[PDB]
Design goal:
Chain D: It is found in: Nucleus. Chain D: Belongs to the NFYB/HAP3 subunit family. Chain D: Heterotrimeric transcription factor composed of three components, NF-YA, NF-YB and NF-YC. NF-YB and NF-YC must interact and dimerize for NF-YA association and DNA binding. Interacts with C1QBP. Chain D: This is Nuclear transcription factor Y subunit beta. The complex is a heterotetramer, with two copies of chain A and two copies of chain B. With 89 residues, chain A is an all-alpha fold. Chain A is built from four helices and one strand; from the N terminus they run H-E-H-H-H. In chain A, helix 1 packs across helix 2. The longest helix of chain A is centred in the middle third of the chain and has 28 residues. Chain B has 80 residues and is mainly α. The N and C termini of chain B lie far apart (35 Å). Classes of the chains: A mainly alpha (89), B mainly alpha (80). The interface between B and C is small, with 3 and 3 residues. Strand 1 of chain C pairs parallel with strand 1 of chain D.
Chain lengths: 89, 80, 79, 88
């Protein structure tokens, strides 16, 4: 399997929560976003694996993810992401 | 959870340089993916509302990708 | 079947515990499934002895007494 | 401070473990809910001991499975290990 994707139903419902209840979403549109999400994860992963691998570490940790986020233009995501981690700790 | 962590792990291990993963990494990606899905959908919906439509279309998502530098890495994923 | 975040919180009631690995809550989730299933089944034996259809707290306390595996539960479920 | 798994989740596992005509009293589910937390705390504290003695910091799979066998749940170790090999 090269390419794997999150289940279309999970992606679809998050999409439905991000628009008014009067909105409808085309089939192609969900699948498009489903593909983008896998690309987004692989994108961030590839930077984190580099930063991790270069501290001769073997496992990608939280810092490497958030570090990769800021590096690749998703620094605005880092602020909530740290909040998410607090609650489970 | 809202997104399956096990499936996120599988996407992570498409990279040759990843073969063991930490506990928090797929959890971070779950929330990040939810935020990302929300961000991309919202941006495409703004183009839908500006055109007084009610069906979000793939054309709209391709549009939102062009108009934000944050989505540059998605330029060859949805072409015109 | 069981939320791992809650299992993690139960683990960290132990004060000699503060950091946990990825695999510990997944082990405990399945272990908790087996434990709930075994304890319930073992208690159902006494439900059947009284030809009842409702499993009662009486049955679980009974099963705890009749298995050495549940010794740590004698002060948790008294009769 | 004391945490319990959701009573509905406990009830579902209990119900799959009984005949199709069987019912569970409110008393019984809540009782099992307490036992399950006790079971986790029980195994954890031995695992933390095994963990600390090898001057480790994080409790890993082996520390759990060692604690299982040490504390009378050796019958769990083989299924748990197989269960911790298919997801890996």
């Amino acid at each position: 399997e090269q390419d794997i994707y999150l289940p279309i139903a999970n992606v679809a419902r998050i999409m439905k929560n991000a628009i008014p209840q009067t909105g409808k979403i085309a089939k192609d549109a969900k699948e498009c976003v489903q593909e983008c999400v896998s690309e987004f994860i692989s994108f961030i992963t590839s930077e984190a694996s580099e930063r991790c691998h270069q501290e001769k570490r073997k496992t990608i940790n939280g810092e490497d993810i958030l570090f990769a986020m800021s590096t690749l233009g998703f620094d605005s995501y880092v602020e909530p992401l740290k909040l998410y981690l607090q609650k489970f700790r | 959870q809202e997104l399956p962590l096990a499936r996120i792990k599988k996407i992570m291990k498409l990279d040759e340089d990843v073969k063991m993963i930490s506990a928090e990494a797929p959890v971070l990606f779950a929330k990040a993916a939810q935020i990302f899905i929300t961000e991309l959908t919202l941006r495409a919906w703004i183009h839908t509302e500006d055109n007084k439509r009610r069906t979000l279309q793939r054309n709209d998502i391709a549009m939102a990708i062009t108009k934000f530098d944050q989505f540059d890495f998605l330029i060859d994923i949805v072409p015109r």
